[PDB]
Amino acid sequence: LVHVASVEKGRSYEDFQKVYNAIALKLREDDEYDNYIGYGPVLVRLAWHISGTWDKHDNTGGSYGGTYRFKKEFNDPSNAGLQNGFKFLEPIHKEFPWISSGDLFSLGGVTAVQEMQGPKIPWRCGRVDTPEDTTPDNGRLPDADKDAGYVRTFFQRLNMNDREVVALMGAHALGKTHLKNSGYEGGGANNVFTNEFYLNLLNEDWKLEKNDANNEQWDSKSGYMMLPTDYSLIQDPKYLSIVKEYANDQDKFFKDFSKAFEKLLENGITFPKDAPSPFIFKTLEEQGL
Numbered sequence: 001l002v003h004v005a006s007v008e009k010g011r012s013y014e015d016f017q018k019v020y021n022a023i024a025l026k027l028r029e030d031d032e033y034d035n036y037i038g039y040g041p042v043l044v045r046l047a048w049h050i051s052g053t054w055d056k057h058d059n060t061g062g063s064y065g066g067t068y069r070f071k072k073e074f075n076d077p078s079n080a081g082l083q084n085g086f087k088f089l090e091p092i093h094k095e096f097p098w099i100s101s102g103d104l105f106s107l108g109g110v111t112a113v114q115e116m117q118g119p120k121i122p123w124r125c126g127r128v129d130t131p132e133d134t135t136p137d138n139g140r141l142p143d144a145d146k147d148a149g150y151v152r153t154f155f156q157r158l159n160m161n162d163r164e165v166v167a168l169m170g171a172h173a174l175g176k177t178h179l180k181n182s183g184y185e186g187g188g189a190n191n192v193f194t195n196e197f198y199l200n201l202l203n204e205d206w207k208l209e210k211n212d213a214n215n216e217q218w219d220s221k222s223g224y225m226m227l228p229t230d231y232s233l234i235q236d237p238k239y240l241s242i243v244k245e246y247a248n249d250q251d252k253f254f255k256d257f258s259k260a261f262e263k264l265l266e267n268g269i270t271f272p273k274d275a276p277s278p279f280i281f282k283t284l285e286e287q288g289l
C-alpha cells in the first residue's frame with residue numbers, strides 16, 4: 001500500500017499561500033465561535049484527527065486520502081465537534097476547488113497554528129482524494145480516560161516517540177473540551193499557541209474529580225482542567241522530564257512541535273524524489289494583511 005504525493009496540476013507555492021490566506025482571513029473574521037475562542041483550535045484538532053487514523057503496520061488511514069469527507073469517518077464518535085471545522089473549511093474549498101481534501105484539512109491545521117502565533121510548520125502538498133472504501137473504521141483515535149502506558153503504546157502506531165508525544169500534546173494549550181462532544185467538562189481556554197499547557201501541568205493545584213458525564217478529570221482551583229491522558233504526562237517520569245523541558249524552553253517546544261506536527265500530517269505519504277520542497281507560508285501579519 002503506497003500513497004504517492006501528486007501535486008495538484010499546475011499548482012505552486014503561491015496557489016497554496018492564497019488558500020492559507022483565505023483560511024487565515026476567515027479565522028480572523030469568524031471570531032465569535034465557541035465563546036470567542038474562534039475556529040483555530042477545532043481546525044488543529046481536525047488536522048490531527050484526519051492524520052491520527054494512520055497505522056504504520058499496513059499504511060492505512062492518515063491524511064492522504066481525505067477520507068473524513070465520508071460518512072463513516074465524519075460520524076466517528078471520536079470526531080464529535082469536528083463538523084464545525086468541516087463547515088468552516090467548506091466555503092474555502094468552494095473557492096479553491098482544485099485543492100484535495102487531505103491537503104485542505106492538513107493546511108487548515110497549519111494555518112490555525114501559525115495564525116495563533118505558533119511555530120512555522122513546513123507543509124507539503126500532494127495528498128490525493130481516495131475512494132469511500134479506503135475510509136478507516138472508527139476506533140483508531142485515542143481514549144482520554146487512560147494512563148501514560150496507554151498513551152505511549154497508542155502513539156507507537158503513529159511512529160511517535162516520547163518527545164514527539166509530549167510535544168504534540170502541547171496543542172492542548174489551544175481550545176477546550178465540551179461535555180456534549182467528549183464527556184469532558186471544559187476549563188479555562190485560550191486561542192494563542194504557547195507552552196502554557198506544560199506550565200499549567202507543573203504549577204497548578206490539581207484535584208481529581210468526576211464530571212457530570214461520569215468521567216474523571218483533573219481540575220484546578222484556578223479553573224483549569226486536564227484529561228487523565230494529559231495528566232499522565234507528569235505521572236510518568238520520562239514524560240515528566242520532557243514536560244519540564246518544554247515548560248522551561250519556549251523555543252525548544254516550538255521547534256519540536258513543528259517537526260512532530262509536520263510528521264503527523266505527512267505519515268503514510270510517499271514523496272517522489274523530485275517533489276517540491278516543503279512550503280513555509282507567511283502569516284497574514286508578515287504579509288501586511
Ligand code: HEM
Pocket residue numbers: 041042044045048080081142143144145151168169171172174175176177178179181182183184227229261
Ligand atoms: C492521547 C491523545 C489525545 C487525546 C485522548 C485527546 C483528547 C481530546 C479530547 C477529549 C478533546 C475535547 C474534544 C471536545 O470535547 O470538543 C480534545 C480537544 C483538542 N485536541 Fe486533543 N487529544 C489527544 C491528542 C491531541 C493531539 C496530538 C493534538 C494536536 C496536535 C490535539 C489537539 C486538540 C485541540 C486543538 C483540541 C481543542 C478542540 C476545540 O477547542 O474545539 N489533541 N482532545
